[PDB]
C-alpha cells in the first residue's frame, strides 16, 4: 500500500515535467487520491485493493 502511493506520486512528477495534456495529469491525480484513500482506509470508497 505504501509503494502504490510512491510509484504514482513519482509518475505524476514526470507527467507535470513533460507537460502532458490535462487529461492524463487529472487521471494521475485521481489515482493518487485513490491510492492514499486505500492506504488509510482500504475499501471505504469503491472496491478494495
Amino acid at each position: 500500500l505504501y509503494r502504490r502511493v510512491i510509484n504514482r506520486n513519482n509518475r505524476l512528477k514526470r507527467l507535470i515535467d513533460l507537460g502532458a495534456p490535462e487529461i492524463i495529469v487529472n487521471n494521475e491525480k485521481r489515482m493518487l487520491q485513490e491510492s492514499v484513500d486505500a492506504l488509510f482506509d482500504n475499501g471505504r470508497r469503491g472496491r478494495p485493493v
Partner: protein
Amino acid sequence: APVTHIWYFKGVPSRLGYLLDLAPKDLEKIIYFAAYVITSVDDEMRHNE
C-alpha cells in the same frame, strides 16, 4: 498534488461537506475530478465592465 483525508471526506456524515457547505455526492465529484468548481469570483471587475 494535494490529497484529502478520507476519514473527514465521508465521515458519516461528511465532516468536510458540513464545513464547506457541500452536499454529499457533490463534494465527492469534485474530489475525484468528476466536475469543476469555482474557487473565487471577482465582483470588482464586472462593476467596471
